[PDB]
Amino acid sequence: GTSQWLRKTVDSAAVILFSKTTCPYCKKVKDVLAEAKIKHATIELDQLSNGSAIQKCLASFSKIETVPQMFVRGKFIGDSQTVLKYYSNDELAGIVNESKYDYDLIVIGGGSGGLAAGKEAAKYGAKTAVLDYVEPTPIGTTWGLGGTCVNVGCIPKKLMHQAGLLSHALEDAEHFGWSLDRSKISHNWSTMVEGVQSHIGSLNWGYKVALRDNQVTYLNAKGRLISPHEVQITDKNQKVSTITGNKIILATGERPKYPEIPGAVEYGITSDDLFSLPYFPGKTLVIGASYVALECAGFLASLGGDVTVMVRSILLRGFDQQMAEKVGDYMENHGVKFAKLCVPDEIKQLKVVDTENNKPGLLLVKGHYTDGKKFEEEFETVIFAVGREPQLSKVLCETVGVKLDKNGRVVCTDDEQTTVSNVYAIGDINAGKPQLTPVAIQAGRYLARRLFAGATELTDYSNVATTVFTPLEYGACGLSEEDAIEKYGDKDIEVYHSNFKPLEWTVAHREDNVCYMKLVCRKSDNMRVLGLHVLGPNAGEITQGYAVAIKMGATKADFDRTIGIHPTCSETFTTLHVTKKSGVSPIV
Amino acid sequence: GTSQWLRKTVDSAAVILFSKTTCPYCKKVKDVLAEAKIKHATIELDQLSNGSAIQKCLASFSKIETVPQMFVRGKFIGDSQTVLKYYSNDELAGIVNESKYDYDLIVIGGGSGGLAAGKEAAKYGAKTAVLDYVEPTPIGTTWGLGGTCVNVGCIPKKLMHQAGLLSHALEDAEHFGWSLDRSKISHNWSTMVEGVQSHIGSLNWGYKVALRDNQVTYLNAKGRLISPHEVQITDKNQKVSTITGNKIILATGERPKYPEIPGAVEYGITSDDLFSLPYFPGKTLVIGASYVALECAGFLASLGGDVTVMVRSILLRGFDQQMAEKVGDYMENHGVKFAKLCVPDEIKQLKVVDTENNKPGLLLVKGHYTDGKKFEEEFETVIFAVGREPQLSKVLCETVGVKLDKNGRVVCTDDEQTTVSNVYAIGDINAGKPQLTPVAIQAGRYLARRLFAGATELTDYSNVATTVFTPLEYGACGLSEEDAIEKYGDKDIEVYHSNFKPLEWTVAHREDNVCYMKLVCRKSDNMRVLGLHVLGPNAGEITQGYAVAIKMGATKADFDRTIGIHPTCSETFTTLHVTKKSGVSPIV
Ligand SMILES: Cc1cc2nc3c(=O)[nH]c(=O)nc-3n(C[C@H](O)[C@H](O)[C@H](O)COP(=O)(O)OP(=O)(O)OC[C@H]3O[C@@H](n4cnc5c(N)ncnc54)[C@H](O)[C@@H]3O)c2cc1C
Numbered sequence A, B: 001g002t003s004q005w006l007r008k009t010v011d012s013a014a015v016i017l018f019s020k021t022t023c024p025y026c027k028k029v030k031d032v033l034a035e036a037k038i039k040h041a042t043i044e045l046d047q048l049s050n051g052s053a054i055q056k057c058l059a060s061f062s063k064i065e066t067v068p069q070m071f072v073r074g075k076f077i078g079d080s081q082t083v084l085k086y087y088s089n090d091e092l093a094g095i096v097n098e099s100k101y102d103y104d105l106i107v108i109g110g111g112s113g114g115l116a117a118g119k120e121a122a123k124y125g126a127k128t129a130v131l132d133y134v135e136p137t138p139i140g141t142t143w144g145l146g147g148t149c150v151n152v153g154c155i156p157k158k159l160m161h162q163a164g165l166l167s168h169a170l171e172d173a174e175h176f177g178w179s180l181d182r183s184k185i186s187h188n189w190s191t192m193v194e195g196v197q198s199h200i201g202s203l204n205w206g207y208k209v210a211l212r213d214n215q216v217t218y219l220n221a222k223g224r225l226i227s228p229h230e231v232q233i234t235d236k237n238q239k240v241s242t243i244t245g246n247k248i249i250l251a252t253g254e255r256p257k258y259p260e261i262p263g264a265v266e267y268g269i270t271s272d273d274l275f276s277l278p279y280f281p282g283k284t285l286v287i288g289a290s291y292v293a294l295e296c297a298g299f300l301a302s303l304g305g306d307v308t309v310m311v312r313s314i315l316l317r318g319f320d321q322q323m324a325e326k327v328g329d330y331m332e333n334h335g336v337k338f339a340k341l342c343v344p345d346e347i348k349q350l351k352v353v354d355t356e357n358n359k360p361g362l363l364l365v366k367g368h369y370t371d372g373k374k375f376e377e378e379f380e381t382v383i384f385a386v387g388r389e390p391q392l393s394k395v396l397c398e399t400v401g402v403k404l405d406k407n408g409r410v411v412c413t414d415d416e417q418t419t420v421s422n423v424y425a426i427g428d429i430n431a432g433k434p435q436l437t438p439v440a441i442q443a444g445r446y447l448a449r450r451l452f453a454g455a456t457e458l459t460d461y462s463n464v465a466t467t468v469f470t471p472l473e474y475g476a477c478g479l480s481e482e483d484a485i486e487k488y489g490d491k492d493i494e495v496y497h498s499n500f501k502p503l504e505w506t507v508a509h510r511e512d513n514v515c516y517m518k519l520v521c522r523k524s525d526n527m528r529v530l531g532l533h534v535l536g537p538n539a540g541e542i543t544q545g546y547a548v549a550i551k552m553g554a555t556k557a558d559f560d561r562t563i564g565i566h567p568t569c570s571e572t573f574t575t576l577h578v579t580k581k582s583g584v585s586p587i588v
């Protein structure tokens, strides 16, 4: 058991010191390593319980049983006297840079997961390269380092959501005594984009600074894995070369899909293009019904747009469907139009985009309803939000041996290892895992620790909480209600639920029984909380804290015995009592 | 064990049915009680662990071992046939209504805890009276049913806090693209107060309707306990009379204190007066430094007031003083002025309140600083927030025998019982317990269930979470840092902390390193989270969820292994890593 850990640790670590906090000879080596700017991992044997068997098992590698012991890339380097001899002889530098490979680690993809993994491995002395390239979109849109969330996802999405929310704040202000008149105030699209892009640029710059400050090589080039240790790179001048690394981490993400209909690629856009568009979209058609589609439609409507969503079948496929419909109902009652059970057939161009005067074009959209009836309407912009997909054929020579699943995602063990023993995958291309930025970051940090510092902790991908940032927000953690019933039967499931009204909505004259929350519990397991759900303001701040208690196995009684904070929306979870089986109304 | 529960339950319950879900003879009796519109508790014996030993023990009262059995106020009434004999002969009404006292329960005080206890008791068949009266303030202010939170506390305070927050929304909206000019917008105090009071009056009426629809007798009168079972009441014409009850719950709350200085009562106001004041206070002095004082000073400045706070020693005594100082630093930097280490000596009247044209008066305030230097300045309004106290000499005849503590609060056991065996106390007047509305509500509901439905659950008063609703809010659960150090020793305590910036603050150009959070952990107990602290927006909604995880014994590892929701402020708790012992900066 313990011997197989020591072997794995010694072989992949780049520079590692085995040590004890009590021994001063270890401090003499530590101090020498610090002075020479030699980054390394350290393992203090007098802090692990099996540390006396580890000191014994070390002798299998060094033929000695004492500390300190310094290793470099699987080879024992020496004890106290031997390291000092190399220092004063000007030999230690070339020792610690001895490698069969150019890099200890090559990361392909400069996004949420890739940046996190690369920064963490460098902290333990691993020589690291991070590659990032942004394939432009069909109209040419491109952006800087940091990946999808930073440039064309969570960060600009939530900023624009926030600009939408501020419209209600101006409305509410009057009722609380302020003198403004909401009807006389308008929104400037390009002023908001300039402010959003300014912040994104400060994030691009910050990431390049952090890689320099960590000694990570940043190459703005497209990477391709041609053999288990060989990565082929193409740069901005189309110049091609090959670099080698010991461990490879794949982290290249996904890009938006287009439907195979005429005019879609030529005349539509995606979210990739939306967050830096020079003109207001104007009258917009959003095709799709994911959170991307609903979040985008939602804030375009609050910013004054004329917005329609085309729904093939259901909203928010994969989420609790009772919550999904309430999410949709609220949008439909607050200025978002819906074309239900409908799909597009072609986009025709009526007006080219006025690039000079900074205006959108004009398009004719044709489709049909599921009963055969026809759809025909004019829009200035057409946004496709019909899913996302990787394209690993552009990253992975097929002869390398990395297995993929049916959707083109990498099949991994629970320690992120692919079918090639030294190649790993993280983030959105890791098959079957939630596609979320906090997940990618955690997965990448923990893997760096396992590869280069002897760590053993795995990433836990179960019960990861979400928030859909629609005009009225929706936060969730755990199973949907229909999933829980499917898994245990209707008779073993109890559901406590209630409406509520945020106190901020009283004086502003907003709806009495629209916000809603529920807890889905398992009778036979002590009324364990299988899933939590809440529709309301600040739904992400509400939900997050509860994810810790769900991780710990919380029950209805744990909620019951905790006291609420008053006045908040979230305290409603601490006094829930109406069950669905009771048939009692949940209104307040 | 079991017998002593059954003796207490039968002796205390008003109407209680010992039943089974399987035996249809019980459904026969339940229907009779439903149609006869008779409310009662029910102890289904097939759904309890030792439900088969209770059945055998029930024969000590009835001499039968079978089910159903119905009791009224300790007396056994009959089985299936005997109860249907009383229903047929129309003898059932007078048998269920016969009591030694006027009521099964008299609640003195119609506030958070009192209204809660009463409505819950009447569910289980208790004949219940709720007394409430509002002693006017020195300048005559008065209000309706619901207690301190509803009328002069949490509810109007947070509403006015929200009007204050809306001023930053107006400022932010420009940077997000909206075309208003915050510089040209002003606030109307009396328009705000009308909105606030209209909501309050809708809650007064709501509570009265709820009491009627539960068959609870509501008397708008002053109650004095003169014997263990006798309450003397005085109505609006000072008509005295006496009613009697089996159980008595004291729940009369507190009122604001005044300092013993000339002019205070005459020319100052308190929070009791602030929330329905018919004129804007104008240039204001707030004397004190509790959460009441800081919350009020905070929203007055945001509404454009000229506000000064006079602090005797420290801000927010009893709270984590690092967080308190950050709270106050924020206020001092955003337009609240502080006069530090200073007390008042006298309030002189320069102008009487212009009650005609709706204008404040004018006062001169004289006081001195702690070194000896003098203070003298003119203000239009002076508000005292120097603590609150109960006045139980009004409520309680000393001959009855209810023991008070040195502060004037009621000494109770862990199930709220006073030193007189049938008299209980809940809420703020219960000595040593947290003075919070959700605590009073839970205590009152759980007690009603123990008195009249045979429940055993006690109220857990440990680790109750709070939120201070200052301009930048401060949420907390568990111990302060200085209290954990004192209890366990500096060497056993580790503190993880970090600054953060809300994403909403980036485009708005707000401060980078003002918001702040920390986890106070005990090393030797597995890094157990002793206390959580966060300063930032929506701090009540951030903190609430974590109160559950803390009740369940959460450790630092439980936080680490939970994944964040992105982008939120709350997710920063899931990746904390900078310790105070390390000396590394917590900036972002
Ligand atoms: C509109 C939108 C909103 C979202 N909102 C949220 C949200 O609120 N919360 C949340 O948790 N998640 C959100 N997501 C999802 C989130 O963006 C992803 O889960 C996350 O970015 C995945 O990170 P990653 O490292 O796996 O991939 P990425 O962040 O996409 O990084 C991969 C990077 O590698 C680059 N690359 C690709 N091929 C190569 C190659 N051959 N060589 C070099 N570099 C290459 C890509 O161009 C990219 O820069 C949103 C997504 C979208 C589209």
Ligand SMILES: Cc1cc2nc3c(=O)[nH]c(=O)nc-3n(C[C@H](O)[C@H](O)[C@H](O)COP(=O)(O)OP(=O)(O)OC[C@H]3O[C@@H](n4cnc5c(N)ncnc54)[C@H](O)[C@@H]3O)c2cc1C
Pocket (backbone or CB within 6 Å): A566, A567, B108, B109, B110, B111, B112, B113, B114, B131, B132, B133, B134, B135, B146, B147, B148, B149, B150, B152, B153, B154, B155, B157, B221, B222, B223, B224, B251, B252, B253, B254, B271, B292, B394, B395, B426, B427, B428, B429, B435, B436, B437, B438, B440
């Ligand atoms: C400005 C302010 C802000 C606050 N904000 C918050 C907050 O945000 N969150 C929070 O949790 N707590 C808050 N509190 C505290 C909270 O209001 C109290 O903890 C809570 O009201 C206590 O409830 P209670 O039932 O014990 O007493 P109360 O709610 O005060 O009810 C007692 C009632 O009994 C009446 N009464 C008194 N004597 C008699 C008598 N002899 N006969 C008949 N009736 C009588 C009183 O007039 C009153 O109606 C705040 C308090 C103040 C002053």
Ligand SMILES: CN1CCC[C@@H](OC(=O)c2ccco2)C1
Pocket (backbone or CB within 6 Å): A311, A313, A314, A315, A325, A328, A329, A332, A338, A340, A341
């Ligand atoms: C089950 N329903 C049938 C209609 C289509 C889809 O619902 C919507 O598209 C919707 C609801 C609110 C706003 O849009 C799923």
Ligand SMILES: CN1CCC[C@@H](OC(=O)c2ccco2)C1
Pocket (backbone or CB within 6 Å): B311, B313, B314, B315, B325, B328, B329, B332, B338, B340, B341
């Ligand atoms: C420890 N300090 C001493 C000065 C007085 C008191 O601090 C304040 O009164 C204060 C700080 C920010 C705004 O006000 C406690």
